[PDB]
Design a protein around this ligand. Structure first.
Ligand SMILES: C[C@H]1O[C@@H](n2cnc3c(N)ncnc32)[C@H](O)[C@@H]1O
Ligand code: MET
Ligand code: SF4
Ligand SMILES: [Mg+2]
Ligand SMILES: [Mg+2]
Ligand SMILES: [Mg+2]
Ligand SMILES: [Mg+2]
Length: 354
RNA sequence: CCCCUUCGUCUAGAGGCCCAGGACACCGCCCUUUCACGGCGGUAACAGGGGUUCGAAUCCCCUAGGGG
């Protein structure tokens, strides 16, 4: 029994089940997440008998890091071992903050055409310990909170491999741990779950946890979205934005706005005609816009909008009063930029034959 | 017998620099451009009780909880 699979409720449960008081769950979480301890013999403020009781009944096993790559950006990407397979995790330092992109499945069940995770197939969901484990290893490797004196991580984004809303069972507990004060103590506002639009699971999310929301929109109408982000064929743009607005109603994390992700595919969806449509489309949705220049990956039929097109496109949106930021491209030299995470996946869907 | 207990969390603190300071969280406002969620602001603690002293988070006692 591995305590990295457990959130606070559950660890309390666990400690009651050992005839021991529930504040013990707070102590152990502090060692685990504030110091990145994987070793009960260091928990100096737990009496020696219980300290030993734990070693018999439980453990703290994060997946192992088996690769590391540094970019001129400063950006780092670690590959973690997940049985025979690998998912990948990205650390992004900016001046006043540090951000971890976290993987949430082994590949992705979805088929976005501009995504490299999509082109590897899909194997399985990640367990809680394999999600929060990514935040655990990255915190230890960077410099643990009460070990260097600084928060190693200030923001997390569920923007690694996989679609988060197709693994709510594990995504939510893991986000719960991130937010927890005896966990990493991060902020609602600085944990951004991004989703391609699995509407029912978003409604479900609303009833489970309040967390900042971004959406992989990527087109200004269904005819295009059908082609690049195929799940649109099952939950279309209007259905999705309705769901989004349902989430935003009951959410402090988002501060009344959703972040719109829109990847910039050269001469596909990135002309000023599209910006005009996009502005219209979003007239009834309080948001801010994040333009993402496309990051390439082997075999793709696409190209990256030139900066002139991006610049023009963004200015149209700005005419209509939208906050429009171009996401700086980070980790491209090591295939760690958004979309480039292929990991190592044993596809179980036969993505190839088809 | 000895040591520890200060906002949600980690802490600042040595008889007056403290009706308790910071960071983060939380909450609020704003995002018509700081964004791989951004800017600003605000609420919030001396474990509980009794003493010593002009004055106690700080010194003494008792209690509860925790460690050797
Ligand atoms: C994580 C964010 O990046 C987007 N995304 C997926 N693939 C790529 C790529 N090759 N380049 C840029 N962005 C991508 C997702 O659709 C999501 O919005
Ligand atoms: C590479 S995408 C990562 C998060 C989710 N799949 C989304 O597309 O928004
Ligand atoms: S984009 Fe998000 S959803 Fe679409 S494939 Fe890549 S990962 Fe899966
Ligand atoms: Mg929190
Ligand atoms: Mg306390
Ligand atoms: Mg102190
Ligand atoms: Mg924000």
């Amino acid at each position: 029994i591995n305590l990295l699979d457990l959130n606070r409720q559950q660890m309390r449960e666990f400690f009651k089940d050992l005839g021991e008081k529930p504040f013990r769950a707070d102590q152990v979480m502090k060692w685990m997440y504030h110091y990145c301890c994987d070793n009960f013999d260091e928990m100096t403020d737990i009496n020696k008998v219980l300290r030993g009781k734990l070693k018999e009944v439980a453990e703290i096993r994060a997946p192992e890091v088996v690769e590391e790559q540094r970019s001129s950006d400063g950006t780092i990407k670690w590959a973690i071992a997940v049985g025979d397979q690998r998912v990948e995790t990205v650390y992004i330092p900016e001046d006043d903050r540090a951000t971890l992109a976290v993987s949430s499945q082994v590949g992705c069940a979805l088929e976005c055409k501009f995504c490299s995770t999509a082109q590897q197939g899909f194997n399985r969901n990640l367990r809680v310990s394999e999600i929060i484990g990514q935040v655990w290893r990255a915190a230890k490797i960077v410099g643990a909170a009460k070990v260097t004196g600084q928060r190693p991580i200030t923001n997390v984004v569920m923007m690694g491999m996989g679609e988060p809303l197709l693994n709510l069972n594990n995504v939510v507990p893991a986000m719960e741990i991130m937010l927890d004060d005896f966990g990493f103590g991060l902020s609602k506002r600085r944990v951004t779950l991004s989703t391609s639009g699995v509407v029912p699971a978003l409604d479900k999310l609303g009833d489970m946890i309040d967390v900042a929301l971004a959406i992989s929109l990527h087109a200004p109408n269904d005819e295009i979205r059908d082609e690049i982000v195929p799940i649109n064929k099952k939950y279309n743009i209007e259905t999705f934005l309705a769901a989004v607005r349902r989430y935003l109603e009951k959410s402090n994390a988002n501060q009344g706005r959703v972040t719109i992700e829109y990847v910039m595919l050269d001469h596909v969806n990135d002309g000023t005609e599209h910006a005009h449509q996009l502005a219209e489309l979003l007239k009834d949705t309080p948001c801010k816009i994040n333009l993402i220049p496309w990051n390439p990956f082997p075999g793709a039929p696409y190209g990256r909008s030139s900066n002139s097109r991006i610049d023009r496109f963004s200015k149209v949106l700005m005419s209509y009063g939208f906050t429009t930021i171009v996401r700086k491209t980070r980790g491209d030299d090591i295939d760690a930029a958004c979309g480039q995470l292929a990991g190592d996946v044993i596809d179980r869907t036969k993505r190839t034959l088809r």
